Design a protein around this ligand. Sequence first.
Ligand SMILES: [Cl-]
Ligand SMILES: [Fe+3]
Length: 186
Amino acid sequence: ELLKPRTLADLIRILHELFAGDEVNVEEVQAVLEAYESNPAEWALYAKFDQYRYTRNLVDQGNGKFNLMILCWGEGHGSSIHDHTDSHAFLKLLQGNLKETLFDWPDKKSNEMIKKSERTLRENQCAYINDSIGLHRVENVSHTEPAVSLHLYSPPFDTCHAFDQRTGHKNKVTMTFHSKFGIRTP
Ligand SMILES: [Cl-]
Ligand SMILES: [Fe+3]
């Protein structure tokens, strides 16, 4: 039974219930993520920015079945075009806006990757992606407002691929945590 998360801590408790089993009800998880009303005091601990690129800040390690982290995007910071390593990926805005651009999986032939669509993800909205849907880039295109997003991945993964927009060629990238549980992890 899906109730509105009252706080971030309540959301985490609810997520532990929703991932108690071996499968994932994507629509339920997205709904509860969306229903949490971002409260900046509850996540300030995790919102550790870097001047030069976006940061990944682990919030909860889940139950063997998911990670939950907060990404902090300075003005103009963005990601690669990337996949999600056969995992579910949910992205909820906690502050600001992000542009999500969708791409199809490239063919083996070297070719420009042409965007299939784009949208602006706004505060409190929750998006979802997986490899069956396609690839995406996420960017804070604002010149004046940092963005903060809440990401849930299931199963957890710490590698993925970045895709060269010019060719479709991919390279494996190892993903690192800027902090874990509020502690900077150099
Ligand atoms: Cl993402
Ligand atoms: Fe992603």
